[PDB]
Amino acid sequence: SDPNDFYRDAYRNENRWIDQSVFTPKTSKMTHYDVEWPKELASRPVTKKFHHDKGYKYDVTTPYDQRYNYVADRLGHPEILGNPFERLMRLEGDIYHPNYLDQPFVKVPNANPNASLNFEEGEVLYENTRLLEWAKFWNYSVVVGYL
Amino acid sequence: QMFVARQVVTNSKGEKVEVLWNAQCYEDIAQLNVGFAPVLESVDYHWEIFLWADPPIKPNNDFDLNVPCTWFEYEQEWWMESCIQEDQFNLPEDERPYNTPRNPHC
Amino acid sequence: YELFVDHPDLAQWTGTYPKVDSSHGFPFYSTYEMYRDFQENTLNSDGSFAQWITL
Amino acid sequence: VAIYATYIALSYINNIWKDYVVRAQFSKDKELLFVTRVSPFGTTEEEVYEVAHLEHLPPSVRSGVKDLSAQDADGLVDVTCMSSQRSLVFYKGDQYWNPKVYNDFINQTSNLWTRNYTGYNRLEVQNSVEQVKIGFSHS
Amino acid sequence: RAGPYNPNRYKDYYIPRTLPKNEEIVEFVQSQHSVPASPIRNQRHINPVRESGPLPSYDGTYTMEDIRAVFYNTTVGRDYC
Amino acid sequence: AVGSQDILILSVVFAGISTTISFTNLLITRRTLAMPGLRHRRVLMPFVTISIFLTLRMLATITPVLGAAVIMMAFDRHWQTTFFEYAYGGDPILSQHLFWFFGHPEVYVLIIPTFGFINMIVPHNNTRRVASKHHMIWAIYVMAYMGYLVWGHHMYLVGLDHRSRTMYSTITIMISMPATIKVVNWTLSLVNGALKIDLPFLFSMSFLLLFLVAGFTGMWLSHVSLNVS
Amino acid sequence: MNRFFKVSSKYQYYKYLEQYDAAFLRKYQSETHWYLGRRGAWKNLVIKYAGDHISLEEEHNVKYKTHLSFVYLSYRLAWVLFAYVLIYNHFLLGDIGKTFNVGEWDHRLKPSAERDYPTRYESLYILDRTQKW
Amino acid sequence: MFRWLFLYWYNSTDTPSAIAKVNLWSYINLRLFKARLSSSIAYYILGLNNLELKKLKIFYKNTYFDYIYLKSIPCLFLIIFFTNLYLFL
Amino acid sequence: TVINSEFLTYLKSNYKISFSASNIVKYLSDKSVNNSVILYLRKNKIFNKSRYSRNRQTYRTGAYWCLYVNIIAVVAFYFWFYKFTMNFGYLWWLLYSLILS
Amino acid sequence: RMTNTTEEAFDEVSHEWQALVTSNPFDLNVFNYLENTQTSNFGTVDNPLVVFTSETPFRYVGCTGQMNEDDYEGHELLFFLLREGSLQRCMGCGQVFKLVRLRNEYSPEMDYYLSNFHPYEMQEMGESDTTVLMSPYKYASHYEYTQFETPSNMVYSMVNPDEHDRLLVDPAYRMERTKALEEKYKVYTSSLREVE
Amino acid sequence: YFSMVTGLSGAALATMIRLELAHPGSPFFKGDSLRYLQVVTAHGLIMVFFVVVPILFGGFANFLIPYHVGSKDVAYPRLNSIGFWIQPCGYILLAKIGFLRPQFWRYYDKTSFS
């Protein structure tokens, strides 16, 4: 690993023509990159009507029915709806904004729980009712002390 | 106002390349005429000097990688030297002494 | 040279030139613009008269 | 100052009490867990969680296990809801547990706290990962 | 008017959508290191040459003396010569 | 009495805070968003920009002093803090010290940017580099940070000690030298070049003519005996 | 390794946990993905779209924006008051008495000021108050 | 792990084009820490055939106090001797 | 991982290695690889060409905030020191414009 | 302290992380620190001074000529618009400028300019537990200190926008891809070890 | 444009001073020494802090600094907008003091009737 010995041969004036020539090295072709990717890239849908000032030829929207469904959980997310108090108050929230909810590729979860779930009560697993009395005692005590 | 001149030069690799001489301004981009037409008039007025927010550049050259000056380098001192020459009085050659004794040790 | 390689920010603050040589052709990875106010606004430089008055 | 001081105090008192669980009831099919929690004024508030999401996770720092309240026989068990990013706190005392559904719950919500969390010896280090076979089906 | 636009609402294809195979990765690494890699840029002047033309000669058809005699005759008027 | 005087006092503090926003935005803009290669090379930037940044630094240094003095004036008028009442320790001359400490750098702040216009216009129309740009930059800088020790030439007759009086006079006259440096540099920039007469150039010549008399008269005011009259 | 044993749920989707190791689950759902582990993360996309648009810039909370009624009242008041300031100070300074009204209120410790009265009713009422210490 | 820029940029196989095939970018392979020169001065001078690198090392940085104390003994005694001469002078 | 001997021999015959790998990953042991954590980077079209993210091009609230600052200063100073309050009724139509709006 | 890119990285932040980890010239050029730009050679026809742009047609460039140690500047600064296309030259000194319009791709042409950029600094990335150092002695030489450490066992992999949404919404898909990527990383490391 | 309006205001104040100083006897203010002093102070303050300063640091600095440093905008675009919209109030306060007095009524107004 002597630096002078390596450099004196590696870099020479008479080899300038080939030293700074960019080329694609010969490597084994990979199907995912050299075969699959060009196919999918070339098969992209094309739209005649696209935003001329800012859009491109490949700005093709994915239909809503083709967007991936939400299957992470069954429980619904009513936050998307916007509670009646927020509606009555006329407050604008980002969580329940029509434009932001209309995600391009994935559907937002349904506000209502999945029909598979059954909400019939079963049997009690854990129960510590005295926490309510403790919570009331502490909360009132701090309020009185704070007042 | 885009390019003030052009030339074709053969580089060391044998390929002929085109070199264009950009129009310049005196340290003031405000005075620089940013135009895309072969026109001297300042037609385009831009509200956003940097439309894409890309910063400009003022390259600093490494002294190690510099090259000896060769772009009319023999003209750097011409202005000051020539201004002095205009007022200098030159003795006529015939009246100027010639064929004087040689230095003993030279 | 040690200050320049190890602590480039302080080297620029002190006004030291890049001490490494790029004759091999590859520019260094920590080069910086020169801050020469300390060495220019001095009795021995372009600010000589200003420092003479200040002194 | 009076309006926000009162608001901050009441709102944060609720957050502190929110983790603790007052009541927990399975559904008929034992697919959901209904949890009653403390309200801002100390009343009952209802929430729903999925048993699958519920999980007892080990501490991020491995030296803090001895500092867990679960070390004590009468300590607190911190069960984490991995979907809602919420925490459920249960007293370890058997007095608060139903003794015919407790066993399945603790055996279902404690799947990620395994032996390898403590490390591998030199007998199981090799088996800690699944060996990858390359080129055996073709050259 | 063109109408609302949001470029983020459209798919991009900068990355392949299929993962590589184990054998192909091993073969690729073997092939990559079995041949020289593409060169990286170098900023060294190799046999530098004058940017302008040849240095004016001491004597000849056109010399540096002819250049020197131009500074004293310099005018930019409103009419051609 | 209460009225216009109080409005001016608060308005001055209001102006000072407006200045605080002004130079804070501009100074940080230069320090954080300057293009690569011009981060620290003050020489390369046009002279107007150089002069503006120097003045902004002066404003930052002097603005708090004015604010404190103006605030003290407000307290004395309303709360009667007796800061400037000689009866119980007040110093009426302290008010003049604090104001003029900001006062003189202010007028220097007003003028320094003006030199930039001539320094840019003349090279542009003359097709020639400005004469000794480096020296002119140091000439304005020395005036900038040496104007903090001449605030007392507005207080020669107030009754201050002769030791302070002499120091203000001596430094004040020395300020004439850097001004002379710029004048000669301006004159030399007009020689041996390709002149393109334009209206901005003519205004520059008018600016030069007015400045010569303006500064010369000020130098006479530095004459202590003449300053008395 | 300690693979996930079984999922006692009727939702066939959740059975993906059975195919991985406990250490793998902890690494990608507990240690640094805790805020993301086994979650939909739809709110991440919705909030991202909310912040990267040109929507109304008036903000009240992280959850809600300023009420439009409050915004409009503030802007309408600002313009009219600003217009009054410019017009009066540039055109209506000839007759100060006709253009401006004199009023004030002093500390309750001192006797009520002569100018302390409700404007537009000085021809109908006289205001006074009892001093307080 | 490189010490010299010319060696570092001579034959690079972990460039973005090559790594893009696997789409894996380990943090340990950052360019920030990839190459770092030695702290000793090294400059190039022209040799018989090409540039050669010469190192200018002046002093070591691992001396200990015991070495320094011994070197300082003559100076300390001279100070004592000069002072005594002044007193006797 | 285990690589088949026949496959390895095939690679050696077809390709002869003459350069050393520059990636530091070669030094990693199995334990280091196992402890590695995978993170995903979202790659999309690039439009902003600066270190700073896109900044809003309008400040409506600031403009009105400054209008109130102007109003407060003029009204407060006049009331405190001049005791003067603008008679909005003199130009009743500007007041009515506020009412109409 | 290091941001969880799979959860938080988006658009600008995601692009910044790509520049740090991959050091691709297109990404690195955009996020190159303004204060310092790597010093380059003096422009010539054979070895022109390269100015990089991130998919923009023109860039404002300024020239001061041949730089010398005594003065550091050749001639007074002159600004011009460097446009994509052929080489361009400065009238005052003849320095040749070449505009390279880098593209968002991984190709040998882009790798050719790896040496022409400073490595992107890491000390300012992520979240800092110290706001700012109240030290007049080292206000312009030290970055903020960190109470915590920076993990170095992180491997980044690029993902498309729709794919990134799939990873977030579907944890099962996230686990499946993560395990596959780990397997490929194991294969990639083993192949490198054999090559050595 | 704001500077031009303030500059005209300063010019108007200067005209009032010159007309008063045209010849002895107060041809303009007619004995109002206090009013003249307020006008003189308004002229000085308006010209200094609201004519030259807005022109240089308000108009020129904002217009030119981005050109001469290479920035998309100032480091604080909000502050730059804020600085501009704050000027009018200060200008009005320092400029109209000559008109405005706490004793607004003229000498011939019978204040005893009110």
Ligand SMILES: CCCCCCCCCCCCCCCCCC(=O)OC[C@H](COP(=O)([O-])OCC(O)COP(=O)([O-])OC[C@@H](COC(=O)CCCCCCCCCCCCCCCCC)OC(=O)CCCCCCCCCCCCCCCCC)OC(=O)CCCCCCCCCCCCCCCCC
């Ligand atoms: C005493 C008061 C104490 C007050 C305490 C207050 C405590 C609270 C502090 C809070 C504020 C902290 C922040 C301060 C910022 C100030 C504003 C500023 O510039 O910010 C820019 C800062 C960043 O902006 P920037 O554009 O990047 O700034 C660039 C740098 O500033 C660079 O600026 P530049 O580009 O303009 O550089 C100029 C510098 C650059 O030039 C140089 O390099 C200097 C020269 C060095 C070489 C000298 C060699 C000479 C020859 C050798 C010696 C010869 C002598 C013989 C010995 C040798 C023999 C061989 O040159 C000079 O002008 C310096 C003078 C040099 C003369 C040397 C004379 C030596 C003789 C000895 C006696 C006299 C010494 C005087 C001091 C000297 C300077 C240290 O802006 C902001 O962040 C926004 C504004 C923020 C404002 C904050 C609020 C400020 C409040 C201030 C209150 C002050 C009250 C008291 C005032 C009155 C005091 C008398």
Ligand SMILES: CCCCCCCCCCCCCCCCCC(=O)OC[C@H](COP(=O)([O-])OCC(O)COP(=O)([O-])OC[C@@H](COC(=O)CCCCCCCCCCCCCCCCC)OC(=O)CCCCCCCCCCCCCCCCC)OC(=O)CCCCCCCCCCCCCCCCC
């Ligand atoms: C400071 C006082 C000084 C007073 C001065 C004298 C004024 C007197 C006359 C006032 C009216 C003048 C005429 C103009 C009317 C408006 C049209 C117009 O030209 O002017 C536009 C004028 C200016 O236009 P702008 O603001 O530029 O335009 C944008 C606006 O955002 C507009 O944007 P937008 O179009 O999107 O918004 C439309 C929305 C107006 O914008 C809104 O959405 C604002 C919010 C509306 C709801 C406010 C009250 C309810 C909120 C829930 C919380 C209540 C408290 C808690 C409950 C317990 C009670 C303490 O309009 C409505 O829907 C109004 C219809 C009436 C709603 C009544 C709902 C009552 C629900 C009660 C049951 C629920 C509570 C539970 C009770 C206990 C249960 C055990 O706008 C307004 O004045 C907006 C508000 C007008 C609607 C009335 C809101 C209050 C009604 C309260 C009624 C009493 C309720 C309690 C009864 C007790 C038993 C429950």
Ligand SMILES: CCCCCCCCCCCCCCCCCC(=O)OC[C@H](COP(=O)([O-])OCC(O)COP(=O)([O-])OC[C@@H](COC(=O)CCCCCCCCCCCCCCCCC)OC(=O)CCCCCCCCCCCCCCCCC)OC(=O)CCCCCCCCCCCCCCCCC
């Ligand atoms: C300058 C001329 C007027 C505007 C341009 C020309 C007209 C354009 C629209 C025409 C066609 C469509 C009409 C439908 C309405 C579209 C706009 C709208 O929504 O309404 C504006 C706005 C309502 O929109 P918004 O719901 O508040 O907007 C909220 C949205 O978020 C949107 O918010 P934003 O971000 O877009 O900004 C909201 C801002 C919209 O931005 C503004 O327009 C800001 C205000 C204007 C600039 C103020 C600068 C300060 C100096 C003003 C000096 C003016 C001259 C002296 C006037 C008094 C003494 C004579 O709205 C306000 O805050 C309005 C405040 C109330 C108006 C105060 C100023 C009144 C005087 C205006 C000049 C009058 C010139 C002609 C008369 C000459 C007589 C000698 O207010 C009105 O509708 C007021 C209209 C009535 C007042 C103006 C007319 C009477 C003026 C009094 C003197 C003349 C009396 C004789 C009248 C004879 C019959 C005409």
Ligand SMILES: CCCCCCCCCCCCCCCCCC(=O)OC[C@H](COP(=O)([O-])OCC(O)COP(=O)([O-])OC[C@@H](COC(=O)CCCCCCCCCCCCCCCCC)OC(=O)CCCCCCCCCCCCCCCCC)OC(=O)CCCCCCCCCCCCCCCCC
């Ligand atoms: C009845 C009057 C009685 C006599 C008295 C009159 C007194 C007037 C004020 C005297 C001082 C300034 C005079 C300058 C006049 C020349 C303006 C000019 O160069 O043309 C515009 C010129 C547009 O022409 P360009 O640039 O050659 O070519 C662009 C094409 O127009 C293409 O442009 P584009 O594609 O963008 O299309 C828009 C274009 C198309 O429209 C036109 O060209 C129509 C003709 C021009 C109309 C200009 C004013 C319109 C109403 C403004 C109301 C405020 C905004 C609210 C919304 C209004 C919506 C209509 O309109 C404009 O560009 C006009 C923009 C106006 C912006 C105003 C707000 C800026 C901030 C204020 C700064 C100045 C403060 C001064 C006061 C300081 C007090 C301490 O734009 C500018 O350069 C902007 C100048 C903005 C400042 C001056 C005008 C605003 C004056 C407000 C009143 C101040 C009163 C103070 C004293 C009394 C207080 C009670």
Ligand SMILES: CCCCCCCCCCCCCCCCCC(=O)OC[C@H](COP(=O)([O-])OCC(O)COP(=O)([O-])OC[C@@H](COC(=O)CCCCCCCCCCCCCCCCC)OC(=O)CCCCCCCCCCCCCCCCC)OC(=O)CCCCCCCCCCCCCCCCC
């Ligand atoms: C049906 C009703 C409509 C409902 C719909 C919604 C309405 C929205 C209205 C929004 C109002 C926003 C505020 C407006 C302020 C106006 C200011 C003004 O010009 O006042 C004087 C203005 C004229 O007085 P002036 O004699 O010409 O001049 C004033 C004197 O010079 C001097 O006078 P002064 O000495 O007495 O001073 C007072 C003057 C201020 O004068 C000054 O300049 C003096 C200021 C002294 C300040 C002293 C301290 C210094 C300042 C700073 C101190 C702090 C330090 C800060 C610095 C920092 C230091 C550490 O300000 C005021 O007059 C105060 C405001 C009066 C109450 C108006 C509120 C209306 C309702 C608002 C809420 C509506 C929503 C309710 C809910 C709806 C749904 C259920 O008098 C009025 O108030 C009249 C206009 C009132 C309009 C009411 C609303 C519109 C409806 C009108 C009736 C139309 C028919 C409707 C039929 C409905 C059928 C269904």
Ligand code: HEA
């Ligand atoms: C832009 C504003 C400005 C500038 C630049 C100056 C610059 C100077 N000023 Fe002035 N000054 C004021 C604005 C200004 N001043 C104001 C407003 C007041 C009164 C404030 C108040 O009380 O309200 C004042 C008051 C004032 C006094 C107090 C007088 C008194 O109250 O009795 C003094 C005393 O020396 C003085 C001196 C100077 C000096 C030495 C300079 C130097 O900077 C000048 C240096 C330059 C030169 C000296 C030029 C050299 C000349 C040539 C190269 C040409 C020579 C040619 C011929 C002779 C033909 N000024």
Ligand SMILES: CCCCCCCCCCCCCCCCCC(=O)OC[C@H](COP(=O)([O-])OCC[N+](C)(C)C)OC(=O)CCCCCCCCCCCCCCCCC
């Ligand atoms: C009777 C009197 C009536 C009037 C009284 C007025 C009292 C004072 C009012 C406040 C003065 C102005 C402060 C503005 C602060 C908020 C600015 C803002 O919107 O933030 C946006 C900006 C941030 O947005 P940005 O757009 O500028 O930049 C964000 C980054 N980019 C551009 C990349 C997207 O934040 C600030 O600038 C905050 C302030 C930073 C520090 C600057 C100095 C502040 C202090 C100045 C001195 C005066 C006040 C303190 C001292 C006196 C106190 C009495």
Ligand SMILES: [Cu+2]
């Ligand atoms: Cu002075």
Ligand SMILES: [Zn+2]
């Ligand atoms: Zn040049």
